[PDB]
């Protein structure tokens, strides 16, 4: 009543798993949009069959037309990059791709503005804390209707690694990672709990050492790289985190989830997006929650936003 | 699987919800055991039809024979009672009845020893922190294989009430309530978090006041009375709490759940069952976690265990 | 809609399980409404705490005010008498409930028309095929927006008992029971399948006999009575069946489910509700499926509707 | 109690979705095994983080060692060969894959025999009805402990396409496709129901025509080619199907599922595996159900088996 419409702008690795998880959870009709011909149509056809196994009823269709954004309730943006003939088979980077992905966000933004200005938008394209603000600018949606992936995914690694050292259920570890997604993400040792108990109690109990925690911190920061070196850019956990955020919206669950949001003085920053706990409910972002960071913690946050500002200033670089 | 076998020793209000939820979750075959004849058979038949709607395949039968404890993987004991004849609801409490219930735990206990010595046991019969040690003594099961209901249920109320004031998902509130189930429950204000963030931060931000938090503490302690005075009794939340515990064992999830377990020097206490965070995994109680309480909190724990020692030395 | 609102008009046995199952499935905010004071508020408080165990976020409140109907997406009507005031168990006469529940339907119906004319309505109150038509008349809702419980629950017994004989998953048995809920329900032997395979194949292979099938038919007709004789009461499976219907609507699943619906010519009958397969999607009843019954099946359906007409005439 | 151990022998496209779904359902610990170095370890690490989102607790690890078969409750085999060299350019052959995949089955089977002889085994590697038998033969496992994927996936296509024409929930359509997986699959029009109701009633009510059903039948057979032509071999639905079968075993659900199993006289066939409805419960295959086919149906079933026999005979 009447079945949510979710459009995946970008139907690559992450898009594929998202469509799969949507059908599993019966969350809404799915449009798998991509600029690549035939590929989304093929994945959508395959995925549509799994409705039988799942006892679900979600239409899954593939598209190469922006017209299919019309009426979307949720839009998830993983579109970007690319690569070209050069110049391989690893020549890609980062800094150079900022003008390229800025231009994809402008194109997507104008189409959202015209075809689904009331959608809830989740941005994924890297660097996410930059790209989400770019989409916000060009789509014209309210600040409470657009967020970026980061904290849900980054904290899942930290939560996971601790739970395995302490031999508890992974979701029984709670942790906050703030500021930005990426190498300057702020891991807050102070805010780690295990079954609601401060982590420092398990350190005092010699269940885990401070050296073991810092080991886990660096592993968390470096997880993307670790997986890229075994395989490629991670996509199962990012999809799961994005679906957890979209479901909180679609089912009005009001989960506290760390995501990238427009900062309006929080942490002393403005005119910029960054990672902070927020509450996602049926109206979008319902609350932005500002952690009461000490001096030393605020310095780390400042560094994260500074890096986002650095990259944002490169969208017209040559 | 072999499909787990879950025996409900007691098929009253809580037994009914537990059978229903076991079927929803496809968790195992269910034996609804009661001393009352025909009633558990009748409930079992009704419940068994919900396998269709649930796409599950759990056998649900009723029994009046202890022999059906044979081969039980998990045994949940709610067999009692629930209030006092001659006693009303505006006085709702608990008394005497302690020796009659000890005699229940003796009889059940012998049967566990005989027919399902390897079962995981969850005790729900009140006073819970007393009744569990009793079944522990009489059944002879290892200490890592029997726990009592308290903290999952008590913290659920506190978590729930705080979540409604702060307008967040109920399970995004975490909280620890320890010592004993009942009026002496230790509500640890310092150990409450919201989305992983200390409660104190929302107090600082004036989203909730210190006086609303004390009002909610009070409401948690007195929830059962509040429900009873409203012409209902709590059984839906207690059943869900118990099934969360039971499922953590059967699926080896290793959730941190506050339950009543044998204290062996924790909190300065021994030869008594107290409520404390523990880890429930496929081998039973895998870890008993001892909170690092300050003296003001250790006094409140001392007192809750005091009241438990008072009711035990008395049967 | 982000958070559906589901109003349970009647918070007795079935209403209790319904609210429990809605929280389990996170399906919507729940209003437990009843004429009895305080009781639905006590139940609603207990049930609300289970949101924690379920990782759900559904408000569950109790109500004695029909104003709570405003905003309802789904209204489930279990409100009614189960026996006549003053009468004994021996003088039990099913026709006696007709004017008593009729008055209740009239009361509820005026409130629905005023406060939630666009809700989807599910009627459970017995005799259901009469009561649903009465509420349809008094509420003024469209024919695609109101249905009665019957075939989901009735086929669940048949499905279950067959599956237990053949040793398969209960949901892998498909069966249709049409016409009316009650002793005249039409058990359609020709339409039973097991894993999609005609039941005849399993009879031919001696996996089950024609006499076993007949005994299962008798068992299915007589289930409520069987359960009542055992000192209970069908409410778990009725609750599950109703939530399956309400969920197919709320999530636009378009499941094929046998429910009581307005007949406009189907089976040669008009101006009456009777059980037939139908599709429940986001807009309500999306299709009414008329079975191509043979001569003998049709006269069984005639006798079921005849009986519904007889009770309706009494009003 | 304790946690089931599920080893994915093959951590490719289907492998990855399987590990994802196992974690979503908290079904058991997963070993992602592959001959390709590092790749399954990368997928496993990524997949393990999803435990937090799923509220699950499944260890997910990657392996290039067969030793990890030790203690497996369920082994799912998607490991194989494909592609081709020199050849130019549309004439990939064949068929020539059969001996290379047989050598994979010999290798896998020897380790299962040594390290997990009591595992339940699900074979996916094509041609499935040939490969499952080869693995049965090389592993030594009991006949009730090994099946091949086919009908769960093949019927999901037919169920789904009919549900969309009739506008009902996909799972409310039931259908039986038997004999073999692949172009000779036997689609039984007579055994199609919709909400329990014979398909012919919808045809009579003009909600679908005989021609539409036949175009749907042809689409069902052409589905893997349709998707290969657009993308690659299908993997999401195949994984979902396989996890449905594995779950019925692990939770003793006793669902009726059409899978490839050893025929011992059913349908007039012996010494060969074929697609047929069967019951999967905690002991493995608990029942093999033989459909009472007519003469025309029995002859399509013979043509399916004869093609299985044909490919099996290319193995020396
Ligand atoms: C924020 C965060 O935690 C993470 C972000 N990412 C990233 O999310 C993005 C997508 O990751 P995925 O692994 O799905 O990449 P992919 O290359 O498989 O998919 C991207 C797809 O977008 C298409 N695309 C390009 N331009 C498009 C456009 N204008 N519209 C739609 N699709 C487009 C392109 O064809 C490809 O299929 C990358 O930019 C990331 O770096 C990955 C992991 C975590
Ligand atoms: C620990 C905790 O947080 C809570 C504990 N309880 C309690 O759990 C018990 C059961 O509550 P319920 O609401 O289920 O009570 P009930 O009266 O509806 O059912 C108790 C059943 O036990 C049967 N019974 C009595 N003796 C028995 C025996 N020897 N063996 C099996 N069953 C027996 C008796 O016939 C009744 O059906 C009561 O003692 C409690 O105080 C309730 C809520 C919370
Ligand atoms: C159709 C079908 O398959 C089935 C129908 N039923 C029935 O569904 C109804 C409810 O069954 P339940 O076992 O829940 O009955 P209950 O007495 O426990 O609950 C009925 C509640 O309705 C209230 N009620 C009475 N009048 C009311 C009014 N005017 N407004 C609101 N609530 C009212 C009354 O106070 C009680 O709590 C009865 O009419 C049935 O015969 C039961 C099984 C199956
Ligand atoms: C029966 C049925 O309905 C279907 C069967 N299939 C097939 O299932 C197989 C795998 O499909 P997927 O899409 O997963 O292919 P992939 O190439 O991505 O994965 C194959 C993996 O196996 C590895 N592999 C090769 N030899 C191995 C060995 N000895 N041990 C373990 N892994 C091995 C190889 O490295 C690759 O990752 C192919 O043979 C199929 O034709 C597909 C769809 C349906």
CSV table of C-alpha atoms in Angstrom, one decimal, chain C residues 55 166-172 174-176 190-198 200-202 204-205 207 253-257 277 279 286-287 289-293, chain D residues 55 166-172 174-176 190-198 200-202 204-205 207 253-257 277 279 286-287 289-293:
chain,number,residue,atom,x,y,z
C,55,UNK,CA,13.8,-5.1,17.2
C,166,UNK,CA,2.3,-37.4,4.3
C,167,UNK,CA,5.3,-36.1,6.3
C,168,UNK,CA,5.8,-32.9,4.4
C,169,UNK,CA,6.1,-29.2,5.3
C,170,UNK,CA,2.6,-28.0,6.3
C,171,UNK,CA,2.6,-25.0,3.8
C,172,UNK,CA,3.5,-27.5,0.9
C,174,UNK,CA,-2.6,-26.6,-0.8
C,175,UNK,CA,-6.3,-26.9,-0.3
C,176,UNK,CA,-9.5,-24.8,-0.8
C,190,UNK,CA,-10.5,-32.4,-6.0
C,191,UNK,CA,-8.5,-29.2,-5.3
C,192,UNK,CA,-5.9,-30.6,-2.7
C,193,UNK,CA,-2.3,-30.7,-3.8
C,194,UNK,CA,1.0,-31.7,-2.0
C,195,UNK,CA,4.1,-30.0,-3.4
C,196,UNK,CA,1.9,-29.0,-6.4
C,197,UNK,CA,0.9,-32.7,-7.0
C,198,UNK,CA,-2.7,-33.9,-7.0
C,200,UNK,CA,-5.0,-38.5,-5.8
C,201,UNK,CA,-1.4,-39.5,-6.7
C,202,UNK,CA,-0.6,-40.0,-2.9
C,204,UNK,CA,-3.0,-44.2,-5.5
C,205,UNK,CA,0.5,-44.8,-4.0
C,207,UNK,CA,0.6,-43.0,1.2
C,253,UNK,CA,1.8,-9.1,-1.7
C,254,UNK,CA,-1.2,-10.2,-3.8
C,255,UNK,CA,-1.5,-13.5,-2.1
C,256,UNK,CA,-4.4,-15.8,-3.1
C,257,UNK,CA,-6.3,-16.3,0.1
C,277,UNK,CA,-10.4,-17.5,-3.2
C,279,UNK,CA,-6.4,-11.8,-4.3
C,286,UNK,CA,-8.0,-7.1,-6.4
C,287,UNK,CA,-9.7,-10.2,-7.8
C,289,UNK,CA,-11.7,-15.9,-8.2
C,290,UNK,CA,-14.7,-18.0,-9.0
C,291,UNK,CA,-13.8,-21.8,-8.9
C,292,UNK,CA,-15.1,-23.9,-11.8
C,293,UNK,CA,-17.1,-26.2,-9.6
D,55,UNK,CA,22.0,-9.4,13.7
D,166,UNK,CA,-2.0,-13.4,-13.6
D,167,UNK,CA,-1.1,-10.5,-11.1
D,168,UNK,CA,-0.7,-12.9,-8.0
D,169,UNK,CA,2.1,-13.4,-5.5
D,170,UNK,CA,5.0,-15.4,-7.3
D,171,UNK,CA,5.1,-18.2,-4.7
D,172,UNK,CA,1.3,-18.7,-5.1
D,174,UNK,CA,3.1,-23.9,-8.3
D,175,UNK,CA,4.7,-25.9,-11.1
D,176,UNK,CA,6.8,-29.0,-11.6
D,190,UNK,CA,-0.9,-30.2,-16.4
D,191,UNK,CA,0.8,-29.7,-13.0
D,192,UNK,CA,0.6,-25.9,-12.9
D,193,UNK,CA,-1.7,-24.4,-10.2
D,194,UNK,CA,-2.4,-20.8,-9.1
D,195,UNK,CA,-3.4,-20.4,-5.4
D,196,UNK,CA,-4.1,-24.2,-5.5
D,197,UNK,CA,-6.4,-23.9,-8.6
D,198,UNK,CA,-5.6,-25.7,-11.9
D,200,UNK,CA,-6.8,-24.4,-17.0
D,201,UNK,CA,-9.4,-22.5,-15.0
D,202,UNK,CA,-7.5,-19.2,-15.7
D,204,UNK,CA,-11.0,-20.9,-19.5
D,205,UNK,CA,-11.6,-17.5,-17.8
D,207,UNK,CA,-7.0,-14.5,-17.9
D,253,UNK,CA,11.6,-28.4,7.2
D,254,UNK,CA,10.6,-31.3,4.9
D,255,UNK,CA,9.7,-29.1,1.9
D,256,UNK,CA,8.8,-30.8,-1.3
D,257,UNK,CA,11.5,-29.5,-3.8
D,277,UNK,CA,10.0,-33.8,-6.6
D,279,UNK,CA,11.4,-34.3,0.4
D,286,UNK,CA,13.5,-38.4,3.0
D,287,UNK,CA,11.3,-39.3,0.1
D,289,UNK,CA,8.2,-38.7,-5.3
D,290,UNK,CA,7.4,-40.2,-8.6
D,291,UNK,CA,4.9,-38.3,-10.7
D,292,UNK,CA,2.2,-40.4,-12.4
D,293,UNK,CA,3.0,-39.1,-15.8
